[PDB]
Write a protein that binds this ligand. Structure first.
Ligand SMILES: [Mg+2]
Ligand SMILES: [Mg+2]
Ligand SMILES: [Mg+2]
Ligand SMILES: [Mg+2]
Ligand SMILES: [Mg+2]
Ligand SMILES: [Mg+2]
Ligand SMILES: [Mg+2]
Ligand SMILES: [Mg+2]
Ligand SMILES: [Mg+2]
Length: 153
RNA sequence: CGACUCUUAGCGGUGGAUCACUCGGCUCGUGCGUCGAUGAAGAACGCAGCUAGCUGCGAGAAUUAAUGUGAAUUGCAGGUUGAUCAUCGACACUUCGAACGCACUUGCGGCCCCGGGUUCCUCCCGGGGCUACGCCUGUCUGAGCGUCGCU
């Protein structure tokens, strides 16, 4: 599958991919920007802390009306949330990348998430009912998620 | 440095433009110029080993016979003295519908002939053929203090 970014060392790099994932794209982008510079153990621990509301995802671009928490000050930001479903989906995908690395025989504890990006999947359609006999869209915003690990010691 | 924002490029998404195709339309021209009470057009309901739609067909129901052709149909199974296709002149063609026994509930009949029932004794059941309107010619039966003739 044609990836967006090629790895600098494909022997020591593994890939994972997911398409048409029923997650909010904006929450997925902000948490992937949080994951993007991390080692795999730190990323797994921080994604568990997001679901347990111990560490937050800073909302940097899509932050309109997003409330302010105390835990965002570790990121140099004021607005943060804890997207649970979005943290679990790219934890399942991170486990898939773990399983793909173990298949290639790469070292488990040296994996650093080198590339990750979130794209917009095709939007799927439902319908809501408004006043004065008007019917409005109830569109979902699913996402494609892409990541590449790299042995970085 | 970092976040955020702007511009450009690479790659990836969203979207289906452009191009190239076309068993489709539009227009012109030619030949023929054919429906129906022997039941038309239209509609309804059914019919396939696995079948919803489209198509084809009518209880003989994706067809029967005959003729031409000549080894297939096919998504999967099953089984040359002619498989399949095409032609189509034979046979068949459920219900409503001008729609025809009366009505349109799928209801109520009447007449005749058969088979069970019975042993012609009417019942009951099943089957078949008739039972609409208008109108032409002829037949039969009639009507009139209509016009007459005769006993
Ligand atoms: Mg903003
Ligand atoms: Mg506001
Ligand atoms: Mg409402
Ligand atoms: Mg209303
Ligand atoms: Mg770009
Ligand atoms: Mg059928
Ligand atoms: Mg035949
Ligand atoms: Mg033949
Ligand atoms: Mg009634």
């Amino acid at each position: 599958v044609r990836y967006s970014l090629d790895p600098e060392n494909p022997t020591k790099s593994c890939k994972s991919r997911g398409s048409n994932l029923r997650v909010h794209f904006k929450n997925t982008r902000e948490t992937a920007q949080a994951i993007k510079g991390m080692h795999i153990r730190k990323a797994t621990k921080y994604l568990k802390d997001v679901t347990l509301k111990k560490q937050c995802v800073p909302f940097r671009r899509y932050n309109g009306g997003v409330g302010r928490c105390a835990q965002a000050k570790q990121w140099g930001w004021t607005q943060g949330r804890w997207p649970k479903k979005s943290a679990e989906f790219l934890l399942h995908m991170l486990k898939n990348a773990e399983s793909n690395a173990e298949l290639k025989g790469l070292d488990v504890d040296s994996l650093v998430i080198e590339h990750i990006q979130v794209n917009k999947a095709p939007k799927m359609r439902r319908r809501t009912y408004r006043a004065h006999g008007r019917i409005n869209p109830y569109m979902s915003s699913p996402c494609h998620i892409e990541m590449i690990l790299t042995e970085k010691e």
